[PDB]
Amino acid sequence: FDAIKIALASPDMIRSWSFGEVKKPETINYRTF
Amino acid sequence: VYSYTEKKRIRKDFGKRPQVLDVPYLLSIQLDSFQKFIEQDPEGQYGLEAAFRSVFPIQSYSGNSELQYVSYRLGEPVFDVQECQIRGVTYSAPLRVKLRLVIKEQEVYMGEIPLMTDNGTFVINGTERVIVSQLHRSPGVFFDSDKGKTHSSGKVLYNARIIPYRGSWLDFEFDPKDNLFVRIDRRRKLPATIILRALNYTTEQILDLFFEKVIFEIRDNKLQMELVPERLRGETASFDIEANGKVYVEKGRRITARHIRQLEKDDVKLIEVPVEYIAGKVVAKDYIDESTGELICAANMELSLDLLAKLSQSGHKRIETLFTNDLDHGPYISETLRVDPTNDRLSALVEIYRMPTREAAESLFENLFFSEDRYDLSAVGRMKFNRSLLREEIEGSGILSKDDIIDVMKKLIDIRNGKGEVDDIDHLGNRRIRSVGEMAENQFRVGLVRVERAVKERLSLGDLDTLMPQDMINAKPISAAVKEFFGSSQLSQFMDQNNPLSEITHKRRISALGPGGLTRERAGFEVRDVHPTHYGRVCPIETPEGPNIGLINSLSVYAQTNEYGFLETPYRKVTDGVVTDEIHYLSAIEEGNYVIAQANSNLDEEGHFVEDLVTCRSKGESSLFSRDQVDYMDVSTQQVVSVGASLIPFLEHDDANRALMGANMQRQAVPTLRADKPLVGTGMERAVAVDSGVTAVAKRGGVVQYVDASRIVIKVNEDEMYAGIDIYNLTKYTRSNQNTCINQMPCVSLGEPVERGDVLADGPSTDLGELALGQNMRVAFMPWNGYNFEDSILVSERVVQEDRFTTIHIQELACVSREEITADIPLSKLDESGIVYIGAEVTGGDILVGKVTPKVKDSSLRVPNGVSGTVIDVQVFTDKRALEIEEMQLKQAKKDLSEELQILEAQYDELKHEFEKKLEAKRRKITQGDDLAPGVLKIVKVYLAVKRRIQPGDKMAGRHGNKGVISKINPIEDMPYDENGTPVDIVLNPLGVPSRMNIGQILETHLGMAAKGIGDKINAMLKQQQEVAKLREFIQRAYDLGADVRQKVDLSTFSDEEVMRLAENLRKGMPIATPVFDGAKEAEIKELLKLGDLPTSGQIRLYDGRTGEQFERPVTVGYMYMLKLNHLVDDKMHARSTGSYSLVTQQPLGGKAQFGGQRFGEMEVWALEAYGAAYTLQEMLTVKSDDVNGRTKMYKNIVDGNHQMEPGMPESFNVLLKEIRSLGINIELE
Amino acid sequence: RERMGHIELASPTAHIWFLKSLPSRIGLLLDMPLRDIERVLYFESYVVIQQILTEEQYLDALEEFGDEFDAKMGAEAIQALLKSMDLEQ
Amino acid sequence: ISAASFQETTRVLTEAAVAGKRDELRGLKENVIVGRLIPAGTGYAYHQDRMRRR
Amino acid sequence: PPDLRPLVPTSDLNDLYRRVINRNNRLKRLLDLAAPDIIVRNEKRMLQEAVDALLDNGRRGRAITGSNKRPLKSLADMIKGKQGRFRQNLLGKRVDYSGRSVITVGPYLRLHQCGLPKKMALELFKPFIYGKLELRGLATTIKAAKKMVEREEAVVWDILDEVIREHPVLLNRAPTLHRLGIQAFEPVLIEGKAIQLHPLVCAAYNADFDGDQMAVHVPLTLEAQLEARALMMSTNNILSPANGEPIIVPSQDVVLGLYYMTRDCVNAKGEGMVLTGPKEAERLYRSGLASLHARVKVRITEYEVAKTSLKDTTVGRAILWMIVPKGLPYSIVNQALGKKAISKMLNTCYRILGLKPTVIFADQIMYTGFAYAARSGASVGIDDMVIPEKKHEIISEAEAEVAEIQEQFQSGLVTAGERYNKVIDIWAAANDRVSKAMMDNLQTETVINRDGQEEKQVSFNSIYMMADSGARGSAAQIRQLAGMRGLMAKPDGSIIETPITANFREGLNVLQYFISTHGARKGLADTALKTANSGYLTRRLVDVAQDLVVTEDDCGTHEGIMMTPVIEGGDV
DNA sequence: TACGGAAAAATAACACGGCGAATAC
DNA sequence: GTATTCGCCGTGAATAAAAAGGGTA
RNA sequence: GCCUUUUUAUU
Ligand SMILES: [Mg+2]
């Protein structure tokens, strides 16, 4: 790379970075890891 | 006249002036502050009863049920002191309170407080940690000022701070606009009208209370003003003031002070005044017309020609207004009345609510200052509230009353105009001490109001059918509020207990850090410096320089904590120029008023001063006063020094720049396995060991029957007994807090009688009651072929041979088994149980405790490299290793109780059966389930020790601050050697004395050369086996030198076998005590050098080691006291090539336990790019840490033999790339 | 370590870095200072889709100018106002 | 990148997102954070050949 | 990503992420059941506050705190400040193949060398051992090569000395507020786990051997090892980047060994004898028949070509001529050779002789200045300096001079401000009178009969040898040592009226040591607090000037500034 | 097995420049 | 329109060791 | 396998 461009995050650019959608507030299970 | 433990190693005091008062209890700010906290006193001033009587009785809102309180009781703890230091259980007895349910009593237990041992510390989680005192801001009125260029902008500023014990801070700050603004909790500043209008005060009631009132009278002219005799001081007017045809004040000219006294004899209450002088003033009074009732003028408005014409049609002859002046009465209060938006009472409370209804705004200000639960002032908080305002009494209510706000505003105008002085925060009277029992009173009261809000909600749904007090109060917030303060908090400091000097100085440590005090990194510059009011109370020497200097400072030897909290030191009262035997504790406020003379003054047999003009101080600065004008005198020469600074000899000869560095390193000396006494010390050295709890101090005196290193018994005498004998279990080779050994060796022989104040067994780094922080080596202040470019130390091989500085470090390797104890991995150090046995010589990198996971993979722990040594004991508690301690403590209980009962035998069946049931009572307290962390079944702790051998890299220094490390292990043949043959043990750089005024380390070296030379002659007279009477005359002649020694011992009182055993401790050298400012002079050491075979000169000629030639310049050899520090090279060396990386970012770890990845830092990137090291800086932050795809390709390249670096994408920047991409900011690479 | 995730919020949310900065990026676009641009965000005031009206002025606005203009609160009204204004205009 | 490491990362990153500010890989604090060759050493000769390539 | 906020057997960020998704899921639960307007405006505000607390902390209505009263770390708290990525994880990345231990003197090793420990450098060069084992064929794998290192047999150390024979190793102090904080070295294997940092670069590090524990680093690849030898080596770091004076200055001990040699004494052993050359003075002194300082005539051979003259040169200065290179002149050697004098001696060797005879010359200064300091015997003691007889009369006069000034204030002759400036006037004049009376008792005090008249010559006290040389003591530091320390300052800034009348040799008083700490603890609180300001000034100065790189050879502009030295003072 | 966030906390309360916002003249 | 004070906000060195704490019923 | 606070300590 030769340059780094910084701008505002588009609603389509944020979904382009993410491969999936998270719906659960709990991080992991309480019983097992 | 001397004790039994002092006859073996009697030490000569070199003090010219005798100490008329002995040293008090060093832990008086810790024990006696906490001793009043435990017992149930009837008064509620000091102790836990102040916390109970303030909360109780708990009365619910319309619940018609009250919770009455009568008494509280502390039972015995479930474990002793020795069990909590290895297990992890908090040393805390159950605290039970009797609570009465009235419109039914039970001694209900709510929470546990950590009890204080004889050492003065607490055991929370198996470690010895003690809360420390606080040099915070005292509750009361504080007048501050910031002159110069700090927030001045060309004008002086005066801010008045009223701070409580707890609640909301109240501040009254000025401005460059000259308007008093009130500040609450450092928020947006409000005008000073609405803070006075909230006290049910009208507009006219503010001006007459803060200003003077002048009377006016209407006549045939326009208006007349009554002259006030207290208003002409500093009054410049362009017109002339006349009175009945007599001209007193000239028009357009500044009058002198002659017209003030001339006007006082002819007081006239009426003069003539023009109409333009009154128009510049304010009226400050509302008036109501009699015809229609309309307001003529508003409140606080300036007069004019039209407003003065309305006074004739109104009909009032008397006009009540003020007088403006620039030096007498500041008009800044009247100018604030045009700044505030509102002037009503109800509309001012809603501004405090914004600081918006009417009921919530009224109840907020009543709960801010007028209520006793939120705002509170104790007897010390009202003492400073009354002393700063010059009130009559000192006792008062905790709330801010209606008359207390107007009294601080009168004093604010006095310090503005110059009538009153401004206070300072560095004054010791302005620094209250939140001690051990004072902070435990408040933090238990934090839990007492967390359960007060719990019962205010539970009593609403209660049926009140004679409810039990157990389910009313809950045990969770009362116990956790004490454990959060005594555990993870700013005041619960990690007490370092490698040597007993650090055990005592941590008790006498005054740390301003905390929730009530200011922190270290954000402190101002003025609080770090020492004020001249630190004389006798707080030492200026013991401050841990670095990030926190000035906030943490040690308390002095004779300083005591008052019941209020202010610091006092005892002074000798001088009556008619004669000092008396009694003492008087005076605080820092009474120090400035009294004329207290200095201790360093020659006194006669009666008590008079030999000089007409003696040195003295009044406000702390140096001055000169007579012997009759002084009021008090310092009781001893150890006033301004602490217990850590007093052990440094010749502190008058030592620099204050280096003694600040000297006593900080003295609080971290490691205990040597052989304790050699200081050859040059202080009389305080005998007092640190007898006051420390880690050194075994006998409670009852008498002869001994069985002296062992495990335990010592003492046959109690007929007068000391009340029966039986006492036992003292000595802690042998236990783990301290800093991974350092603690062992208690005995010092008395068999059949040796001791008194109550004597020592039966010296602690770690102690011998025969004298604190031995290090060892006296033959220090030669000379360079030797290098190795002394700086203040580092060149040491002998003799020091390595005879173990003169090798210490023991006992490290803890805990094993969390969430996980079987069996060591079935998919050795010789195990006893077929998975646990290492006692005494195995382990090596760094083997298995220690086997712990496999149920799946079978091995995920157990191992010993790190560099700490290879033997194991002291493996404490297994909650399977074959667990029952070994359970039978060892059973045999220890069968050795403690069987020895107790067999003494009183030489009826009998009842006295034998009562110890059998006490054995099973001690058995039940051991085999029971220990309280551990939830989730595990048992935890095993390995007390792994390692003999830290002296080597190049160990930090060693004296008590004066000769900071350095060991250069190399220089052999005994290479060191310089005197004419008698003995080589030096330490070769030291003599180039510190040009840098700092460190001649006191040479006064110790010259006195150590004299003390060893006398001890060499005693060793010479013992090898030749001379007479006992001729040996007595040499010791009697040796203890008689000096001008006027305060001991004046007599060897004729010592027995023939007593003086023969005296020379055994005198064989290694002569113990010599010298005070810090009443020390030996330059002529007294040269006179002491005339006694020995060595000459009078401090430097003597000697040959070189590797050369064999005599020096043309003689060097100063001697037995200077040196001590090994805690910073050792075995623990402060960490090397990592590859290891485990961090999980947040792909980077190495910190600490030697985490394999030791060295952090570069932002300061070292700029030093690397300064030379132009582009290929090295690109390696230093990518190949080492960031390039995960690169550091494995590099690790396959170095083992191949090719030193080639590839350019890669750093993943540490990809850590940064995801952090910005996790926000709403787009960032990409091109 | 490289793959990320996203959440679909029921209401739009204003960015706190662009809000509390000096100067405010949201405040300079809507030509408002810091004090009133946070009152509509934390649901104390309302803006139209400009002028700032409080909660007690919203009950009279629907019966007087309710058919001419529509007002909302929160960052949904901020996003609708930034969708209404143009960069070149 | 060089301005966000000094101070005001909550402010100067908002100043650069609303304004573009695509830096041309010049500066020493930037090349340290992005992790490549420094243009103030022998990497200046690498940067001299990099301008010859571009 | 989940590796960016990893769970551990509970973090400070994943619990903050639970505050946002709980608010995000509750707003999805309000849309399907047609929630009223009152409850959806409060739920959207706490949803907006959850994102306001996630992306930032400290800029909101109230900063969110944890359960243990600490402020919770947001996404902004882990990107800014010292705990952010920019300072802790992008500028402060931890470094593998790099250790840290205390530093030592190490006088036997050369300037380009230092001392690395045996078990420490084996743990730092652990893949370098594995590379040489697979090259020769002792262990041609990676598993059994780890067993050969951890067994510590005899064949591991012979492999190790080949790797560290000429490998550059970066010695690095943990505070580097200077360019010379990172210097490379070519270490040798020693015992003891401490590094032997060179004494000639000890003044360049600005860090004495006071037990300071500091880092160490190595370059792995060959393009980074040449950066350490050509730029970061201690051999070509003679001159400081700040000034024209060299940063390699003899500070305490090697200059003390040079100062005892370069001295002149009458009635010495072997006074007034001829010597064939400078090398014969080593024969003259090691046999012990002649002293180190004796007025003799030695033959020397000076270069720029060789000239020879018989000038007045003592025995100790004749040891220096075998140490200096050929082209170094004699006129810089003939003085007393103090620390301020030999700063130009190292500078003139860099100027006309070159760097190649400078490294051998600087190492042989350190070899001669250390070995002859053992033969010197320059020490500190109560018999070395002496309280002058004029000091007890000056203090008795100054205590009698403040008696009549105090009596004039009681009668009303002077004011409060005129009296306060007069006491400091008569004490600083007494402090300067006792400074010169103590100086002559250290300059021309001890005399020896040189077979005739008693002549006045320079005293051989070891305190004055450390004072005239300027090595570790200045003119004011020995003033505080043997004489009174003078006027001490108050914590606010004013001066104590009555200064310390006594001195450190016979000890101070209780109040005299207490007012001595009013400038000593104040100056140490000044030292420990300005390093937090100068450390912040170090970051503020580099971060604005890091963009400025030299890029052109010649531009062609004649614009510039006018240069004028300091003229406003009295002396230049 | 649930919600994570609010109001009270009988909270903790610094200092030297700086940038923008809300007033007096 | 022009300052002007102030609320809040940027910063307050660097580096090694130990301790608890890691949500509350 | 860690991380963050707090305390002690070092330069
Ligand atoms: Mg140092």
Closest residue in B to C14 (Cα–Cα): B1224
| Cβ contacts from C onto E, under 8 A | 54
Are the C-beta atoms of B796 and B983 separated by less than 8 Å?
yes
Residues in Cβ contact with B1172 at an 8 Å cutoff, skipping those fewer than 6 apart: D38, D40, D41, D42, E227, E231
Residues E262 and E317 sit within 8 Å (Cβ to Cβ): yes
Q: Are B718 and B705 in contact (CB under 8 A)?
A: no
Give B103-172 as a 3 state SS string.
CCEEEEEEEEEECCCCCCCEECCCCEEEECECECCCCEEEEEECCCCCCCCCCCCEEEEEECCECCCEEE
> Are the beta carbons of D38 and D32 closer than 8 angstroms?
yes
Handedness of CA E447, E450, E452, E457 (dihedral sign): negative
Q: Are B1163 and B1170 a contacting pair, CB within 8 Å? A: no
Question: Residue B240 has what DSSP assignment?
Answer: P
Helix (H, G, I), strand (E, B) or coil at C63: coil
Burial class (CB in 10 A: 0-12, 13-18, 19+), C54: exposed
What span, in angstroms and rounded, lies between the C-alpha atoms of B510 and B233?
48
CA distance B972 to B795: 9
User: What does the alpha-carbon distance between residue E158 and residue B398 come to, in Å, rounded to a whole number?
Assistant: 79
Distance CA B1002, CA B999 (A): 5
Judge whether residue B146 contacts strand F, using its CB and a 7 Å cut-off: yes
For residue E200, is it left (φ>0), alpha (ψ between -120 and 50) or beta? alpha
Nucleotide nearest to B957 (CA to C1'): H10
Q: If you ran DSSP here, which 8-state letter would residue B1225 be given? A: E
Chain E residues in contact with C13 by the CB 8 A cut-off are 47-48, 51
* H, E, C per residue of B708-745: CCCEEEEEECCCCCCCCCEEEECCCCEECCCCCEECCE
Q: Which fold has domain B694-765?
A: OB fold (Dihydrolipoamide Acetyltransferase, E2P) (2.40.50)
Which regions of B842-963 does DSSP assign to beta strands (E)? 871-877, 939-948, 955-958
Q: What is the DSSP string of D10-40?
A: HHHHHHHHTT---B-S-SHHHHHHTTS--TT
Burial readout B866-896 (b: 16 or more C-beta within 10 A, e: otherwise): bbbbebbbbbbbeeebbebbeeebbebbeeb
DSSP string, B386-430: HHTTT-S-S---SS--HHHHHHHHHHHHHHHHTSS----TTSGGG
Helix (H, G, I), strand (E, B) or coil at E430: helix
Show which of residues 31-50 on chain D sit within 8 Å of chain E, judged by CB atoms: 32-33, 39-42, 44
Place of tokens 């064999």: B1108
Which tokens sit at E475?
């003119």
Q: Is residue B57 reached through a cis peptide bond, with omega within 30 degrees of 0 on the bond before it?
A: yes
Q: How far is ligand 1, taken at its centre, from the CA of residue E102, in Å? A: 10
Helix residue ranges per DSSP H, B494-570 = 500-507
For residue B754, what are its two tokens?
A: 């001791």
Q: How far apart are CA E355 and CA B711, in angstroms?
A: 70
Q: Closest Cα partner for B134 from B402, B443, B461?
A: B443
Q: Which C residues in the span 15-44 are in contact with D, Cβ-Cβ below 8 Å?
A: 17-18, 20-22, 25
d(CA B1074, CA B1084) in angstroms, rounded, equals: 11
Q: Quick check: B167 CB within 7 A of strand F?
A: yes
For E407, left (φ over 0), alpha (ψ -120 to 50), or beta?
alpha
- CB atoms near residue A21 (< 10 Å): 10
What's phi and psi for D39, nearest 5 deg? -80, 20
How many other CB atoms are found less than 10 A from the CB of residue E113?
19
Residue reference for tokens 């399977």: B879
SS3 of residue B484 by DSSP: helix
- Whether the Cβ atoms of residue B164 and residue B375 lie closer than 8 Å to each other: yes
Mutate to test the interface with E, among D29, D31, D37, D47 (most CBs of E within 10 A): D29
3-state secondary structure of D7: coil
Judged by DSSP in three states, B183 sits in strand
Q: Which nucleotides along chain H are within 7 A of a protein C-beta?
A: 1-11
Contacts of D11 in chain C (CB under 8 A): 17, 21-22
d(CA A31, CA B823): 27
| C7 contacts on A by Cβ (under 8 Å) | 21-23
Instruction: Report how far residue B147's alpha carbon sits from residue B153's, in angstroms, rounded to the nearest whole number.
Output: 10
**CATH: 2.40.40.20, 2.40.270.10, 2.60.40.1930, 2.40.50.1020. Which one for B637-693+766-805+949-1132?**
2.40.270.10
The answer to whether the CB of B1067 falls within 8 A of the CB of B13 is no
Window 1-33 of A, Cβ < 8 Å to D? 1-8
Question: Which residue range forms the structural domain that includes residue E450?
Answer: 389-523
Local structure of residue E99 (DSSP, 8 states): -
Residue B1175 with chain D: CB contacts under 8 Å? 37, 41-43
Helix (H, G, I), strand (E, B) or coil at B1122: strand
- Which residue in the block uniquely carries the two structure tokens 């393009």? E223
Q: Is the CB of residue E356 less than 8 Å away from at least one CB of chain A?
A: no
- What are the beta bridge partners of residue E313? E296
d(CA B1228, CA C18): 19
Structure tokens at B310: 């309305």
Q: Are B1164 and E26 contacting, i.e. CB atoms less than 8 angstroms apart?
A: no
**3-state SS, residue E162:** helix
Is there a cis peptide before residue C23, judged by omega within 30 degrees of 0? Answer: yes
What does the alpha-carbon distance between residue E426 and residue E458 come to, in Å, rounded to a whole number? 31
E206 CA → ligand 1 middle, Å: 8
CATH number attached to the domain at B556-636? 2.30.150.10
Given a contact cutoff of 8 angstroms between Cβ atoms, the answer to whether B773 and B666 are in contact is yes
Closest Cα partner for E438 from E394, E388, E503? E388
Token output for C17: 């870095």
Burial of B54 (0-12, 13-18, 19+ CB in 10 A): middle
Contact D11 C25 (CB under 8 A): no
Beta strands in B416-515 (DSSP E): 492-493, 509-511
| Statement: B806-878+930-948 belongs to CATH 3.40.980.10 | no
Q: By three-state DSSP, how is residue B61 classified?
A: coil
CB-based burial of residue E485 (10 Å sphere; 0-12 exposed, 13-18 middle, 19+ buried)? buried
For residue A12, give the chain B residue with the closest CA.
Answer: B1226
Distance B782 CA to ligand 1 centre (A): 20
Please, which residues have CB within 8 angstroms of residue B69's CB and are 6 or more apart in sequence?
B52, B53, B56, B57, B97, B98, B99, B100
**Cβ proximity of B1184 and B1139 under 8 Å:** no
Q: Would you call C73 an interface residue with chain E, using a CB distance cutoff of 8 Å? A: yes
Q: Is the CB of E26 under 7 A from strand F?
A: yes
Q: In chain A, what are the helix, strand and coil shares in percent, each to the nearest 5? A: 20, 25, 50
Domain B139-211+330-424 carries which CATH code?
A: 3.90.1110.10
How many angstroms separate the alpha carbon of residue B1135 from the centre of ligand 1?
22
Shortest CA distance to B1181 belongs to which of B1151, B1153, B1216, B1143?
A: B1216
Distance CA B159, CA B178 (A): 12
Query: What is the C-alpha end-to-end distance of chain D, expressed in Å?
Result: 22
d(CA E392, CA E398): 10
Whether any strand F atom is under 7 angstroms from the Cβ of E42: the reply reads: no
In 3-state terms, what secondary structure has residue B964?
strand
Query: Are residues B666 and B685 in contact, defined by beta-carbon separation less than 8 angstroms?
Result: no
CA distance B424 to B619: 13
CB distance B627 to B612 below 8 Å: yes
Per DSSP, the residues of E373-394 read HHHH-----TTTS---HHHHHH
**Based on the number of CB atoms within 10 Å of its own CB, is B610 exposed (0-12), middle (13-18) or buried (19 or more)?**
exposed
Q: Which two tokens stand for residue B1220?
A: 């910005």
Question: CA E446 to CA E458: how far, in whole Å?
Answer: 8
What tokens does B135 get?
């040099």
Tokens linked to B400? 């801010």
Tokens at residue E164, please?
């560290």
Angle at B748 between CA B743 and CA B749, to 5 degrees: 120
Q: How far apart are CA B632 and CA B1102, in angstroms?
A: 52
Instruction: Give the residue among E179, E187, E193 at the shortest CA–CA distance from E218.
Output: E187
Using the beta-carbon criterion (under 8 Å), do D34 and A4 form an inter-chain contact? Answer: yes
Neighbours of chain D (3+ CB pairs under 8 A): A, B, C, E
